Symmetry: C5
Subunit: 243 residues, 5 copies
């Protein structure tokens, strides 16, 4: 018939200690391209989960409702953030952000692209193998499945528009020092996942795949150090049985 699955997917911003869940390690700056060795806890990664479905005929994903969870937490301007001026409140989270989700019946297919092909990525990350200068533009060698939570750095990977026949994905990147976060919540908004032929993602092995990245911006500490802040994403997916 029809079934609904829901999930809250936690962000994977780096979590530099047991208290700073949802933040990255402070950002380094001005590393030469030839000596760029980022620490694991400084690198936000894609979130993903496989949701098992009742077995029989295949589950077909028809609609998704999704939103970013805890957007009002950024109205805490009393904790940790640099004052905007003498006697002023804390600096809001602002700057470069990326909001991305995907729903599919297979893992999200990703293409690798690097700012700096010579970056030395740390143990525990999965990044483009044997990168060249061409890895800074399009290098068709860099193909991956988003098949591990907290492993694929957001800065290394994008959804692959040449694949993903069985996934729908949506993402917006906004770059800049002072970019304001703009986030909407409503339980009245639905994305239809049906393609031009009226067919949604088909859950291959009774598995539904949800993927996210919600880098909200940079938190500026009193010291001037900066950390990424991320938030969880909710998914509610309606499925129907197809032959």
């Amino acid at each position: 018939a029809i079934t609904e699955v829901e999930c809250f997917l936690n962000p994977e911003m780096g979590d530099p200690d047991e208290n700073l869940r949802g933040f990255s390690l402070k950002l380094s700056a001005e590393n030469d391209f030839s000596s760029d060795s980022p620490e694991r806890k400084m690198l936000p990664c894609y979130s993903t989960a496989r949701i098992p479905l009742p077995n029989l005929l295949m589950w077909e994903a028809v609609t998704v409702q999704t939103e970013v969870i805890g957007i009002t937490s950024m109205l805490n301007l009393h904790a940790g953030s640099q004052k905007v001026h003498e006697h002023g409140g804390g600096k809001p989270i602002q700057g470069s952000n990326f909001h991305f989700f995907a729903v599919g019946g297979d893992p999200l297919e990703m293409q690798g692209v690097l700012m700096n092909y010579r970056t030395k990525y740390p143990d525990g990350t999965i990044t483009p193998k044997n990168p060249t200068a061409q890895s800074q533009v399009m290098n068709t060698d860099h193909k991956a499945y988003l098949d591990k939570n907290n492993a694929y750095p957001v800065e290394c990977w994008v959804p692959d528009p040449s694949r993903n026949e069985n996934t729908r994905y949506f993402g917006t990147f906004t770059g800049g020092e002072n970019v304001p976060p703009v986030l909407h919540v409503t339980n009245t908004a639905t994305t239809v996942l049906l393609d031009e032929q009226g067919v949604g993602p088909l859950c291959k092995a009774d598995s539904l795949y949800v993927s996210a990245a919600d880098i909200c911006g940079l938190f500026t500490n009193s010291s001037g150090t900066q950390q990424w802040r991320g938030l969880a994403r909710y998914f509610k997916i309606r499925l129907r049985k197809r032959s």
Copy 2:
């Protein structure tokens, strides 16, 4: 609050109007609509915000006329919310640049209200259901607030323990709580957060705009126990005092909700 019978009968329409005041903190009797001045740079390990500094969600339960003559029959009637017209009241008050605000430069006018803002409303037949999320799980929240109980590091992302009903006016801090998209089957909610030091407030008014509250099946919120719930948060931005201190500024929200009678089984 005005509950008006626009039409009687089977095709009965009722319109409920109300002005929900903001709950920005009100640090003294003269600064209604404003918070206490903001502190800054508290370590996560010693973050003890004062009550009057924390904007809270506004909410009211509006009782409706009882529809069920005899409680012992196959079909009962319930009020169904079909549309809402809503706007923020007093947006032009921010054109007062002569009172209290820091000059933008030598010989200049006062600094406009600007910076992080949040505009939110909900209409439902049950209390708004909220999920807790914290900037800093170690924040020590003051007496008179209701905040996530026994928070952990997971409370900075998603901790499913932090479930609450917006069941008290001027108590749930906006920074601790969001509407819960996993619940609220019987509420419609809408909110926009815009963060940043210099974000301009952008506010529209018109008596020509209506939000339809009907779901995919053409059913609006159904008023359980003859109760309509309105909720709001309208943090317009930060007011900068001549000293350089900053206070949140909030404004009241108007609601006009059109309801009709729906028959349901017992």
Copy 3:
């Protein structure tokens, strides 16, 4: 009144409504007095010429009757735009240079663009930044304000019944009234907000409600109201003045039958 059918077998009225920014001298029409800053809430006594006010005009219409069914003028559509937006491309006159050897500073900052069309004067609700503000002679402002006047105080009800008298900072259109008026406004606040203004003669606003009924000129009068604060002009001295522009209205009306 009970509304019947549209009479078949249309007229258009137009008006240019001047802004009321304060007009501090005979040469500065369209500007306010220089803005004061940092007045304590307890001693805030703004000068009349510093306070932009709502603009309004009544357009008289011919009565349609002689004697069960009467005729009334019904407003169906309005075309409206702000007049003189290109005047802000004058960066040579009076404005502070943006830097050494540069052109003048554009008008920018907080702006408010508002219009209403109705068959009754616009109904307004009072809200104050500072309830203790002492408003000057010649203004009409909320009577006996309290701290609650900084949020919603239902005592503060007015008719926009005088041109150049109701300060924009004290009054908003009242969404709890205005049964017989349509209003539209946008406030954009901030030091450096860029003005964004569109002109086109191809845009029409429909004034018909859900039942297909426009404002009814019950007393053979049509009411137009405006506020168009474009932003702040920064003088070479560093002083700032509000700048306002006129608004054009073209309203299409038809005859509507109503029950006596």
Copy 4:
């Protein structure tokens, strides 16, 4: 004046194309498409802008295939875009470095993008920042302006009947006239406003009014008007000049029967 049916058949449809060059002031033989460097901080009582500092409206009359005297050419659609937007990616020539060792400063700041298509010259209304501005020989500006010229003065009516003569800062399209023209403009003011310009050959603006009637070409003439001030160019010295670009028009016309 009375509009009847669209006439079809062979040669009942025509398309005209044209490029309108911008008229930014052209301060010397090499600086076509730029203004003279901007002055700043002139007192309102002593504001004497040089001709070459004042961008003006562009306009042209396009003759159409002669029809006799009744059929008229009716403008149905226009495709239009600004030409040469990528020229602003030259940050090596003339522009002030953004900081030590940086590239040149992009063109940015106040901009105005405007076009009109009609069967009569564009009708304009005059509005001035400063009524006391002394406009130079070779410009056509509001005649005998008063303080009221800073808001709405109904005396200031003109036809856009001369290319490179009507300063953009003095004139706007008149919404009270232009029955037989369709115009569209956006003003964006501010020091740091980014230019945002779109190109595509797939986008069409429909010129038909509510009754399905386009501009009707009196005397087999089509009128195109433009102003495309893209922003300010900042020289290494800090001096600023307006930069303008040409506008392309492709207009589709059909034959319409009317009566006299």
Copy 5:
């Protein structure tokens, strides 16, 4: 003379950006920008000038003739998340802060047609002396700073036509569809969307797509994302590759 639709093929392509590539390690970047060259002595180096990207995709030789007709395109910019690397090379925003994001003037442009993209030349400075290896407006005058109808070119060579010299020509391109947005300014934030759910229809008002004249499909792009600011304060253009997926069908025509 276009007759009935007669079946379907799909071509896909990744078009690399041509930002200047100042050395073998800085593929996708330009040479550092010069500033404040007088209009009378403006001699930009080749590797400082982003150029239009283009490729001709040969299609099966179908020959009343049949021609391949382009019906839809799906396109997006590839690698937008690479700009979240604020640890490599970029100037700190302040003491102890992270690197400065890529920002400033950007241009995002694509075209699909059955002929080479037709371009019109327009120059900031007609006196610019363009370097060997570029194709720029021939015999420019002051009118070349506004509209000079002499400056007509085909985008017929990859990495040769500087973006700053050329725009798509709206007076031609009968057999091409093009789309571009320019956003100018020092601190403009890049805003880029990805989704595999967006399709652009290439059919004109008569329901006819670009017709592949000599069994050739033409894709063109420019995706200048903004300026990268080095620790030193020097700036370089950053560009990204563009993906195309084009659906074609067979169309009967007279001849």
